[PDB]
Design a protein around this ligand. Structure first.
Ligand SMILES: *[C@@H]1O[C@H](CO)[C@@H](O)[C@H](O)[C@H]1NC(C)=O
Ligand SMILES: *[C@@H]1O[C@H](CO)[C@@H](O)[C@H](O)[C@H]1NC(C)=O
Lengths: 94, 91
């Protein structure tokens, strides 16, 4: 199936502008947060901080990335993120 | 002769797709050669380890029939290949 899929992905990313969020002019993007804490490694009274390790998962919907043909969820190489739009989520107090 | 056979391997190669993308899972073989444990901290409850971490898998997209020997390419080929997303859970 491998050739069929490269095309469906290539078309997804043909003309895709990473500068624009989903629904650029339209309604806001509902972004779903999901955290799986691995560990708190350290707690400093001296510096009044703590060090945290987590899996930080985000779910959102970009209609530009829909595919009908294929019958499974597509796990692509991590490097695709560089050519996708992702939410500008940061940690205010880090 | 060889530059072409390599160039054709990587013509149209999608790094986004694993081997057998829709198909069965990829058996990845692990092989570790420990060089040293440099430190063990009871205070931070960690240790520092140095290893050679080798991985073997099979990408049929990278088969070459003509040549009868194993091709060591420059390390920079990795950037234009698919590699497994192996990490260390507890690092
Ligand atoms: C793809 O993900 C959805 C969750 O949105 C899940 O219900 C579905 O079973 C997944 N597909 C496969 C092939 O497991
Ligand atoms: C080439 O790779 C095969 C498969 O691992 C191995 O058996 C063989 O020894 C290698 N060739 C040389 C010249 O060592």
């Amino acid at each position: 199936n491998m050739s069929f899929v490269k095309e469906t992905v290539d078309k997804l990313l043909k003309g895709y502008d990473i500068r624009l969020r989903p629904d650029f002019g339209g309604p806001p993007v509902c972004v779903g947060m999901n955290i799986d804490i691995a560990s708190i490694d350290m707690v400093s009274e001296v510096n009044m901080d703590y060090t945290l390790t987590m899996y930080f998962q985000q779910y959102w919907r970009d209609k530009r990335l829909a595919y009908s043909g294929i019958p499974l969820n597509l796990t692509l190489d991590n490097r695709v993120a560089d050519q996708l739009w992702v939410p500008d989520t940061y940690f205010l107090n880090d």
